[PDB]
């Protein structure tokens, strides 16, 4: 199915962008150290990112499950 094949493509790109995104956050934090933010000034910022990250992994997780289920049924 070209439609089902496209979903897989979109999901994949999203997963790859998630790595890229996590690589960019890491890079940003390294800069933050050397530099200097305000001591704890970025705590909530960091917290918000972990919230989205966790949500994202969750969604990707459900999507991968839905992907296998759409490939057998549809």
């Amino acid at each position: 199915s070209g439609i089902v094949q496209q979903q897989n493509n979109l999901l994949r790109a999203i997963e790859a962008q998630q790595h890229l995104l996590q690589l960019t956050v890491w890079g940003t934090k390294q800069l933050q150290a050397r530099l200097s933010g305000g001591r704890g000034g970025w705590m909530e910022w960091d917290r918000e990112i972990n919230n989205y990250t966790s949500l994202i992994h969750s969604l990707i997780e459900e999507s991968q499950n839905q992907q296998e289920k759409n490939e057998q049924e549809l």
Copy 2:
């Protein structure tokens, strides 16, 4: 259908990833402001593609709704 349902998750991922990215964007500009390089142009690129993404996410929400109301 499982396709529309999944497309919803994909969209929420894109949206969550988008918000995540915007946080990265804010942080970087904070960093740059605490410091050459021609950053106003970069500023322009950010804004443009930020506009574009917002437009795309909004239109995806609209279609998602239309699809969930049709399938």
Copy 3:
């Protein structure tokens, strides 16, 4: 169909998102190259996913086009 138009929407949302990512990587590079460095591996990691994402994107473009020409 509404489905194929949604994939067209999601694909572009991903394309646009890719630019912001590359731009944020860019700014990071300028700042990092201003302030050894465990970055050598960060750079290798970046290039890898960038190429993969551009590969996934164009692949999706090929698919998007094919699905639309058959009116799915």
